[PDB]
Design a protein around this ligand. Sequence first.
Ligand SMILES: C[C@H]1O[C@@H](n2cnc3c(N)ncnc32)[C@H](O)[C@@H]1O
Ligand code: MET
Ligand code: SF4
Lengths: 702, 643, 440
Amino acid sequence: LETSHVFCCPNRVRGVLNWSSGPRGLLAFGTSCSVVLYDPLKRVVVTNLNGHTARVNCIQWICKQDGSPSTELVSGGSDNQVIHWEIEDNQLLKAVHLQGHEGPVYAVHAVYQRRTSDPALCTLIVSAAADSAVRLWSKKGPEVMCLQTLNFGNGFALALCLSFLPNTDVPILACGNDDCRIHIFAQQNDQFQKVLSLCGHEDWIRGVEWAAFGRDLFLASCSQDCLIRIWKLYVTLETVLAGHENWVNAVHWQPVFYKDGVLQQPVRLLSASMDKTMILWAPDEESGVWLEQVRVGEVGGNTLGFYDCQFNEDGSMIIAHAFHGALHLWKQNTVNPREWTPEIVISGHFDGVQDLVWDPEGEFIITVGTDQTTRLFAPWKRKDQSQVTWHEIARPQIHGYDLKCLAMINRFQFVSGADEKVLRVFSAPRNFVENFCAITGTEPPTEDHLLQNTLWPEVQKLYGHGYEIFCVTCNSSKTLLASACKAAKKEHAAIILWNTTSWKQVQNLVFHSLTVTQMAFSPNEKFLLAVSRDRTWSLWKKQDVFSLFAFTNKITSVHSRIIWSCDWSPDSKYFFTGSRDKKVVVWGECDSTDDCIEHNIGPCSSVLDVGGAVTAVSVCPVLHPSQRYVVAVGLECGKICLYTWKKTDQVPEINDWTHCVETSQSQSHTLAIRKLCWKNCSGLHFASCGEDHTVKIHRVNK
Amino acid sequence: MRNLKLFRTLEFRDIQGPGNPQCFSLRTEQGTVLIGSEHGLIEVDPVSREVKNEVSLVAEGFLPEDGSGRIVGVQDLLDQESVCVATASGDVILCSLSTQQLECVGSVASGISVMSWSPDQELVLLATGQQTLIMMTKDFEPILEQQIHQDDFGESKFITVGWGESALPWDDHRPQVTWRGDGQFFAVSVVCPETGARKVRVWNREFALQSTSEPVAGLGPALAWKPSGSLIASTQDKPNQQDIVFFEKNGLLHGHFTLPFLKDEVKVNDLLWNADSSVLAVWLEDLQREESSIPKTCVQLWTVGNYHWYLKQSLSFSTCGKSKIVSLMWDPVTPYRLHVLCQGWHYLAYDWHWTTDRSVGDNSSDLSNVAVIDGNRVLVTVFRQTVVPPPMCTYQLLFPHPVNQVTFLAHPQKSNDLAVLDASNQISVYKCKRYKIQFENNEDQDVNPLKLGLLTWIEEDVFLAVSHSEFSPRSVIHHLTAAGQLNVSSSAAVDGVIISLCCNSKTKSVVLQLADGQIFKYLWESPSLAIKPWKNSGGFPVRFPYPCTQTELAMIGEEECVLGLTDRCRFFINDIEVASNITSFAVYDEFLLLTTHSHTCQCFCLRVLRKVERGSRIVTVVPQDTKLVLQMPRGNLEVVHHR
Amino acid sequence: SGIAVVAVMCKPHRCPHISFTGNICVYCPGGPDSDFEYSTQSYTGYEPTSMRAIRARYDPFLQTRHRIEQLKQLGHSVDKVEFIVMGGTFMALPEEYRDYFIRNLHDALSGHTSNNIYEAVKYSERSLTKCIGITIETRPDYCMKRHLSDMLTYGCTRLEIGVQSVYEDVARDTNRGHTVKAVCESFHLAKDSGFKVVAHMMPDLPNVGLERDIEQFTEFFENPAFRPDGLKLYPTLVIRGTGLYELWKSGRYKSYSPSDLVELVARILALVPPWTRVYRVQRDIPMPLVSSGVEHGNLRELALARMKDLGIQCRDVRTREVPYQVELVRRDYVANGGWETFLSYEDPDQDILIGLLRLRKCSEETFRFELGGGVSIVRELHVYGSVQGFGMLLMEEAERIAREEHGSGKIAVISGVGTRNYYRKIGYRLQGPYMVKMLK
Ligand SMILES: C[C@H]1O[C@@H](n2cnc3c(N)ncnc32)[C@H](O)[C@@H]1O
Ligand code: MET
Ligand code: SF4
């Protein structure tokens, strides 16, 4: 069971994006409650570093002394915990947890110690939390402990940096603060006496950074007062200033890179601001007065952003992290040094995904998110490489309401619902068809073209439901819709059937007394099943226009609580129901074509007990000999399991169900699952989404 | 914040004539009562000091002819010089004065239960026995005759969208009519034969049925429209308590208050408003306990402050029959004056004025106390320390009986005590933060309710009271002192009626005021207790042109002087009349403070112009910190520092 | 130099009393069920705040930033701001959305990114751009103890409870949903909580005559039950899409004559007490949408002109607000079972106002744990003049009369965020949401 593809986007925090310096380098931005390793060479992520319970805020690599690519890193989240991560080759060996720091952790830094006697990679960690506190952590081997702490009373720490004195090995610490008074001093028990506290800025200082020293320790200072000040340390201090309007929040010097055997240390800076601007200050040849090299950014547009900017290896590119979770990568033109171009990167929903559905042909997947957006994902064939990558192709609509349900009728026709009373229908335009055929058989678009030039029209507007739409479905022939509304009374909660060719109500089945969670037609197209929050289900049969044929009162229901999902069988002979009672029940009726027996509906098979709440049950569409059924279950904690069911002879409760492969730690969602959609077959792959802002495509074969 | 006070008890008794008087009216413009009895109409002038006798008596005994034939209404015709009279038989006549001639003007085939007149005396209404109210023009021209038991709601219906106990047994079936102050609407009360309970209806001036009463349970047979504003009072006897409620023009209940009696002990007879919509008079009757033969017949006066109905004064009457009230009314020309006619041919006139019960003193140990009466409780506020808004108080004292009068001792250096007179003619003394009850003395002689006049506390053991004689009105000063209080002495009956009994804490000087205007200096410690005309600079002619509601004694310059203020915004200083715009004033430690009605506050000192809101009345002054406490009509106070 | 007002609006949502009844109030225009797209509630979607909010798709952060930028552009400085959350019944949404909204507001103002509301407020306390307070509107049936506690946590310091008319038949016939007694109880609880209540009134309801309106307003300013601190006038407008529109179309309702309306406004203004403020006298609904109602926007000016003509004059806070000979004036009264005090500084002859304060003894119905020992309270301090400084004098005198008259031992103040530091500088400590000082 291998995870083919994953889609996600970074969190909306300062300093969530970090990149190792080296021949390869690695990005380590954080999604909801996990850290993502993603190669930037227009490739896919490699692993997922799960483990945090709450949101993840700060990520930083451990700088390597000898120019090697980084090996370990640190992440501090909102779970009051700081995690040190070690990987050998994309493998997540021996993560380490660190406790303390009540309140969210909002700053971390890590440095390799210069120990001479013990070369066992002695590491130093500084952590600043939301409790006006900063603490230390020295790690040697697997030995971790805290050290001298520092309270700020009411003040808070905003930016942290750590380095060494130019000649003597002295660990120096520069802390940002909320009082325009960045404090630079020593920290250890042997050296923790504050020496100086600069006061150059006139606002909250959101950035400080120890620079690569030619011969004196250069230092950057960045505050909300729209000023950047460079301070030189030698035990003496100097001061230089710069100029650029609006909030400035991201400053970093160019690191050292090995140019053909010789390390190189240029002089350059990099500033990212809320006004959609990013600057490349450089000292002057004549008098060393810093002057701009190039203005880059969406100047004059909307959606003010650029929380972060980070500087590529050897100045090849620059990456930037914006307000709405969208990255921006710029690449240098070797032919023209004074010219840069945007580049293609990863994307994804910035809020919990709710639903998706496969392409009827099997090429693309469409997602809707509580971020009030609809997005489309399709693979890229390129021209030569056997490796195939998937990318965000189109953004059909940016709605003003949340989205909950979605259905597909034609290959370019889909119906969407929202937390409102109406239903919407969308059709692909003609430009999209040609652009897609060029992509599948030009290149994936960048961010701005997606944001502005890519939308879909509205064709219809379905009325007359009464309340918020909660579920949608379609039949096999793609000719009859079905929807339900969120309701708290028997009258309101009713099933409405529409006609696809006319968009008019046809019939108004009403049997349930509370909200209907999910419905499903049958491949036989002679039944329709609906489970409700009333801890019960109903089955409706078309007559030769639908009538009631099955029934389930309170007593005749094995489930005790809300039934969450339901599914049919490819032979249209049995069906399955998963509830919040940690139990899945398959009901067998064997009734198809003509059955003159009245009712006779029974479970006919055993009951299981998964580890937790069930929110998605799916049945693989293809059938194999031995009449052996397979079921995919999406649990609540975030894991997915596969089970196999075979009909027994006389006793249901004897080895009725067999176990199969389970999702491992790396390939498992974090918060909850919402759908399990198998790829269409008969002219293995399936997709899963949830509230992790992430979409995953899996693969398995026997 | 303010209280009523009695200053005139005109009384004429032993009226002779026909038997069992039934109803009466009043004549203004040098007129008097016009009692009409079973035989005819009697005119009596009691106003004259030495003359209280019938004038131009007439008889008509041949219309009812020895039968019941009760007169259902008597009304003066203002300047027309005639008295319209309606009899129960169904005849309306127009009599005449000095001519003793009759004039039958209208006849009705059914009994005329109630006859009422418009305030402007232009339209008159007849409640026939046919349940058909009728309008007559001023000169008895028929206008309209409408049924009273019509069922439809009327005109002022409610526009609505689709989104969403019988009558009291002791109530005689009898219609009651009223009018509003401006004469634009009127109200009719009647029992509903369909239902069996009272049900009010409101008519426009031109017989346009406006609204009908909501079906409230336990409605009583009372009806009284407040002259100004829009309130109509009634009773809503509930299973647990007895309450007085209000309607409005649309016919909906709105606000009420509670009568402080038992569940089933009394009943309501009638409700009357004063001349300016400021005092409500309620008449009650003892329903049960025939052993004492209705020992209680109380009339009470109620006022409103910050939406709190106080109980100001209470009057008691026996129901023996010899002294039993048969009618009562308010003077339509001047406020705070009511007239009462009893069964035994007795006529009474009561006059009140309006005052605050301050506590003057020296510069130290003063506390500037202020006292307010409310039911059987007294609210005392110490304005030196805490400036409490009116509805609350610095502290509260409770009594078993209702209170009628309070006073502060005038002894300097001890002006921190008070004497209270209850309705049971008992005196309670409170003396020096909190207070403990010192004494509850009982009077020796008391025969008529509310007979003691102005009660003044001069020395820590003496009290001065005023009693008014019946024949040849003469005022007698009583000295009350004892260890049970004995009327030790009674001064000579002076010629006339005394209005003011102001005293000075300094020099222990007492000043008397007569109705006509002379000022007399009486010596309470005199061996002869003789009175003396007030001493002016020379000739001693001091006489106020008009009686003064408030009289004060202040030492100006070196000698003493008398200051007076009347109800017509006139200020007198030993008969000088400095100016005529003042509304209120006060004197304290050579400081004269006074409003001006021209929105200013003069601060003349004895040996300057600030700005004030509308209608500010001075309440109290504290020379310490030099702070004075104005009061606005809406209820709030206001402390200001002049200097 | 001066505080800047920032108005934000919420997402559309149905009012709560639609379930057990049939519909919403018979006159409120707009709403999710109305014919105006993105009509939150009581708003067509044409006032500047309306499309200003729509442009951000009802995002707190974006709306705050856009308004701040606009104000900064036109010279105005933004050191001090005051938030106003409009858009119908806010305290009916699920808790999660409310927490989201308020936390986003605070973080937008500050810059720090928070998880819960507590971290947001802790960080915003340290900001360089200070927030004086927040104001929200709420129906009386949603102002119980828990709601008040939540409002205290958010830092809101001023309610906008709307009681349309004192008569109960009017409420029951317009399907308002509650009773007047509930309104009085809500005022009682809010006043003993320590807020600054401002009420809404509508002087043209159906089945209400001119005489009824005058009487009800006189009672409103005389009855110790109501006696509010600030008043807004909203003359009724007949907007399409409401039950009132159906009534008017059916030829069963008529609007007041323009001269009659102007005169009524004149009398109401003349009757206003000195210590009560008049925020507004009109509604900003676009003119060509109303079928019947007010004449034009020139309503305040006509009222003042007629009042000057008839010899009456208005003495409210706004008109009397702006060396000169100043003096201390003190006023006291009663409201909702509480002893209210109105210490102020003013110049009599030129009837101008400089500094003011609001004290109140705490009743026996108080429930907040910080107030359980006879604590006083300071509902509001406001100074806009210049000279020690007047604020020192007002606080000193208020503490004096609290220690002496009220006989209290502890004093508490309600404040925003920067005001917390201001009061801490004069010797206060923070307890709960209040700023407390032990008064001997
Ligand atoms: C925001 C304020 O608008 C008032 N309001 C509701 N409907 C109308 C209308 N048709 N015209 C004017 N004001 C109205 C509400 O009563 C609320 O107090
Ligand atoms: C916007 S209407 C006024 C606010 C709230 N809906 C109320 O009626 O109390
Ligand atoms: S409660 Fe307020 S906002 Fe809601 S419908 Fe009624 S008036 Fe409009």
